[PDB]
Structures are given as C-alpha cells and as structure tokens.
Ligand binder design. Sequence first.
Ligand SMILES: CN(CCOc1ccc(C[C@@H]2SC(=O)NC2=O)cc1)c1ccccn1
Ligand SMILES: CCCCCCCC/C=C/CCCCCCCC(=O)O
Length: 258
Amino acid sequence: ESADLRALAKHLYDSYIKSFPLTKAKARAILTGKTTDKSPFVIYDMNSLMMGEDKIKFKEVAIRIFQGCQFRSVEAVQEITEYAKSIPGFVNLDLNDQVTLLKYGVHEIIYTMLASLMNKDGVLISEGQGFMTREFLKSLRKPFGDFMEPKFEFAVKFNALELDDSDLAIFIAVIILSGDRPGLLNVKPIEDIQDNLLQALELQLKLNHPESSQLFAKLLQKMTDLRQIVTEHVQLLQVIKKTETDMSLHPLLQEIYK
Ligand SMILES: CN(CCOc1ccc(C[C@@H]2SC(=O)NC2=O)cc1)c1ccccn1
Ligand SMILES: CCCCCCCC/C=C/CCCCCCCC(=O)O
C-alpha cells in the first residue's frame, strides 16, 4: 500500500534531517541570496584563502586544502553511518554485511550530497560559512588540481534533476542497501530492504515531481556516474601515497579504501 511507503518516506526524511546538519535546502538558500541564511566568505585565490581563517574557523596550501577534505569526509562518514542505522532493517543485518554496505556505500553517498553544496562555480565549505571556487581548486599543483573537477562535473548533471532533501533521503538509503557489493554474506535480506526503498523512492518521485517524466529511471542511471567518480578518486589517492610519503590518510578513510 502507498500509505506504508509514504510513512517510510516520512521516516527516512526525518532521520535525514536529524543526521545531516547542512541540508540541500540550507545549501541552496546560502548559494542564492535568501534572507533565511547568511552569505559565505569566498576563497578564490591564495590571499583570500589566508583571510578565510581570520573570519571562519578552519605545509603547502594544496596539501592543507586536501587535509581539509579528508577531515570533512571523516565527518560525513560519521553522519552517513548515523543515518544508515535509522534505515529499517539495517541494524538487524549481519554485522559483517553492515560494515560491507557502509564501506562501499559511503563514498557514492558523499559525492551525491556534495552536489547539494555545489553550483557550477564552486562548493560550500565549513558548514556553509565558506565558498571555495571551482577554479581555485582546479589551479592547485600537479596531483591535487584535478581531484574536484569530476565531482563538479557530476554535480552539474545531478543538480539538473532538481531533487530536494526528501528525495535524497530515500535515494541515499537505496545506495547503502546495494546487495551487489563484493563480499556480502546474505544478499537476500539486503535486497528485500532495497526493493522496499525503491518502491518508496518511486512513489516519492511521482508525488513530489509529478511532471518530471521518468525521473525515477534517470535517478537510478546516475548510479553509474557515482561509481566512476569513486574509481578515479582512489587511483588519484594511489598517486599521492607515493609522491608525498610524509602525508597521512585518516585511518577511518584508509580502512574504507581496499
Ligand atoms: C573542497 N572542500 C569540501 C569537501 O569536498 C570533498 C572533497 C572530496 C571528498 C572525498 C575525500 S577526499 C580525501 O582525501 N579522501 C575522501 O574520501 C570529500 C569532500 C573543502 C575544502 C577545504 C576545507 C574543507 N572542505
Ligand atoms: C555530503 C558531502 C560531504 C562534503 C560536504 C562539504 C563540506 C565542505 C567542507 C567542510 C569542512 C569540514 C569541517 C566541517 C564543515 C562542514 C562543511 C559543510 O557541510 O559545508
């Protein structure tokens, strides 16, 4: 019954709000000019970068920026982990599979929600207090200058779908519930959950976006864009492990990366 699916949608939305302090609706109001939120400080060069610390509370610069993304992904992983536990049935699955769904789901989710913080020209940072331009990121030196560009490219295409947070909450849950992750022990109870999430997503997109033809199909097709984003990024991490042997990846992050 649709009623059961609407209640699942409400539930997931509610946990989403509770686990992610910076929603897309807040990101959007910061990026456009609404009076509900306050304007960010903009970092577009190395000198405004240094003024960013005397205003916002935040070793060559490209490295230090990179340590900033590191720290933020660790935080996102913590938030995603908190959100996963709220998805009905997730905590009743085998503990090894729970680790496995998170291990592979977490980055596809990060890049999905990172799109919420992006327009074609840059990305919100520091809980929306800052805005780091796309071009300042693309001008970083040799290995670092091109770690964000693919994420911007995805976000521009993904943001065209015009999903709002109640859409994303269900979509994020579908991602984490992927029974095709390598090494899963009991694929079948995972798929039963994902099939219920997919029904909830489908209904949600139909009621929330009644005029957007086949949005459901186009949203799932976006799942291959995420997969390729993850693969390019880990090959880029393997370059930096060797060219800066003096730099430390956060242990939560290197465990996710196998
Ligand atoms: C560009 N931003 C926003 C965060 O944007 C992100 C970019 C990449 C990732 C994936 C990380 S990157 C890494 O080192 N390993 C991962 O899993 C996660 C977030 C900055 C920049 C400076 C300070 C704070 N925020
Ligand atoms: C969901 C995608 C994960 C990345 C969100 C983007 C965060 C930008 C950089 C943040 C610096 C990390 C310190 C805490 C600030 C949270 C930032 C934010 O959510 O805007």
